[PDB]
Design a protein around this ligand. Structure first.
Ligand SMILES: COC(=O)c1ccc(O)c(I)c1
Ligand SMILES: COC(=O)c1ccc(O)c(I)c1
Ligand SMILES: COC(=O)c1ccc(O)c(I)c1
Lengths: 294, 308, 307
């Protein structure tokens, strides 16, 4: 009966809508929900450090009344079985937030822990970032369903997979614009196409950056790590092809002049700074929502 | 009032230990009902060698007492390197209401405690692990009731921190403690004599034997621990062959009382000191035991702060 | 506008007095001010770790009702994977203040130029202005009014404590003397800024290699370690030049009979200061160490309400 959140499609379309609505309420009233008052603990474990993931989660948990126990990459599983660690953590904390690499490690922890496990960021998915992206799109553009989103650059990385899955879950027509060596994992693509039939969305994968941008409502990129990606740069030429009032997203950090140009990132279509803040609100909502169902 | 420290299990008298364990039971039922550190007031939690389960239990426990744990890993300069230990203790005493320290040699804890003007707690050391044994006693009481007169046997390395603390903390609770260990691996003589003298006051006893089967027979509680600490991996000994007859396995457990329970200071190395069947079977109390580090350490801190 | 505290003369004499008054009030009532209730966040960022800096700030923020997010060395150093400007914009969305221990002053200036929350220099190569606030609180509680006191600092005259004692000291009206050997003198820009500020407060600046003249008639004697970790490979013999400037019993006996002794910890007993001086009746190093908690909480309270 314990819900986990390891990939974007772990939420149904109706569940994802609940979490995003909660994120909006929490942005307006950040200390109104105190499910962890006590404080109750939440584990925030990094197999590899991520300062942005730490600020977001550590502050968010505290604003829910809890105390985050942050374990930096100075690992889980060397000492004892992941199953034994999961059993003990379940006695100390009400949720486990974990940044690890392979998906099989997250699945293993989730199969044994008796508290919710959240994928903070992994090799294959970045589902919390995409919740923050969807919150940012909704507050700038309103209804998500039927919007057109294009992601540019490395189509094999965790953002491309999560934009496909979380995007179609929200009714967004998602396009990935990527060069040949760097396309979405085929099982993720197939999961996105199936979910997309439930929401009226669709999946497109192309090497044509110009067609990806033409008519886009949301344009997204991410760092590249490098010649194959240059045609996919978000520059101002690409952005003129989009629909009026298009918004640009980029989970930070950005390498200005590589995947994105100053003019795009500092211009009026950029929503990168609101996007960064909304990681706090979206992750708090996810936690609140998981905790009440577990 | 004198400042009370908790560096070894016998730092509590039998009556004082009973007060702490009763408070641990109350705190398990009502975990935010005691707020002596409301403010927050600080508590230092220092690791000369990192321990992640010591971290979760103390960091959360201190927060639930209303306090704020300042957690210092060994990534900082080891205490005693950049400035004297006495200088550090004097400064710490201006910032925090208690000092929790995982360190190696017991003389370092003694030194800190002699100069600090706030309680010092041994979170785990080479010679003792008294906080773990408080959690063990809480767990035993939960399962069996009165501790006085129970029979507890520990198996494996008889000179490690858990053997020493089970001796001292166990006899302080009135438990008849047996250590089953091979020759060359027997309890420190000073700790054994201290346990024998304390056991006189409680009606307990101390037994040390190389006969694992005899130690298991009639026991109410069977305990083991890893055979080798990190610092012993390079000591030159074969640290498998001497201990294999002391494995806590189904055969050994079946020799004990039908109602016996099994304890183990985590992490366990399954297949070495304990088997999967025992670890995962119905006699195992290891998960409740791990949880009770939280409650027993909170009780200890509440009790020390009130007396200091 | 947003106020920052990057060096000691970022506070005017009147503003410094307000922060020091607040520090005394917070020492008496340490949880009575809750500007960060929520909790609101405060970033505490270390380009190079300092355990003493971390404890003081982490507890202080919590006692203001906030939650400190501590970033130790081990994260990618600010500037490596992203512009300081971009990091500052994102930080400003998460926290109500940025406390940063870094190296060159230009990095602090850059952060403060674009951050929309107060930026505090926790400790840097050029200045240690939070420690000097704690020193001034310590002197005030031991001596009363600061104006007109005579303070002499001994040792490396170009380190961050020498620079902040000059600037923070003259801001408080203290006559500051730096006693240091040739080649280890205060930065000229810092000395000139102190000399300008001293005209406003009736204070004065003296730089001298004459250790006995600097101790004579002093109300406060201060020293610091002769070498920072980043100076250990600079090629200099960093012991012989400084031995004449040791804060020892003979040097203390030249000062005013009611003189006090300060040293931001840790001390290397036997080098810059002796056991007899560290542990005798003139030493105020333990109160000084504690007051870093109260002075830093005061600064945060004051910056948060002005910004
Ligand atoms: C939410 O993330 C942050 O606030 C953040 C990002 C990058 C940084 O280098 C630092 I320090 C903080
Ligand atoms: C109470 O102890 C724990 O919850 C714990 C133990 C071991 C670990 O490796 C980790 I991550 C957490
Ligand atoms: C405020 O500074 C301290 O309290 C402190 C200083 C040095 C240390 O090694 C440790 I642990 C704490």
């Amino acid at each position: 009966v314990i819900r986990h959140f390891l990939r974007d499609d772990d939420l149904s379309p109706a569940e994802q809508a609940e979490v995003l609505e909660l994120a909006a309420e929490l942005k307006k009233d950040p200390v109104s929900r105190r499910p962890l008052q006590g404080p109750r603990g939440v584990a925030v474990i990094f197999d590899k450090n991520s300062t942005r993931t730490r600020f977001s989660f550590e502050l968010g948990i505290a604003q829910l009344g809890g105390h985050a126990v942050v374990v930096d990459s100075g690992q889980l599983g060397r000492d004892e079985t992941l199953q034994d660690t999961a059993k003990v953590l379940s006695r100390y904390v009400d949720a486990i937030v974990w940044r690890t690499f392979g998906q099989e490690r997250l699945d293993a922890m989730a199969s044994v822990a008796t508290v919710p496990v959240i994928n903070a960021l992994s090799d294959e998915f970045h589902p919390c970032q995409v919740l923050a992206d969807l919150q940012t799109i909704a507050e700038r553009k309103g209804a998500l369903r039927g919007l057109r989103l294009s992601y540019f650059g490395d189509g094999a990385n965790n953002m491309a997979h999560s934009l496909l899955l979380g995007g179609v879950t929200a009714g967004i027509h998602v396009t990935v614009a990527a060069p040949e060596g760097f396309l979405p994992d085929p099982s993720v693509r197939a999961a996105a196409e199936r979910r997309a039939q439930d929401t009226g969305a669709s999946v497109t994968v192309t090497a044509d950056a110009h067609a990806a941008a033409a008519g886009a409502d949301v344009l997204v990129t991410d760092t590249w790590t490098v010649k194959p990606f240059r045609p996919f740069q978000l520059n101002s030429r690409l952005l003129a092809l989009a629909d009026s009032d298009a918004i640009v997203l980029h989970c930070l950090p950005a390498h200005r002049g590589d995947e994105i140009t100053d003019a795009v990132m500092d211009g009026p279509a950029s929503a990168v700074w609101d996007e960064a803040e909304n990681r706090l609100h979206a992750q708090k909502a996810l936690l609140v929502w998981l905790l009440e169902r577990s």
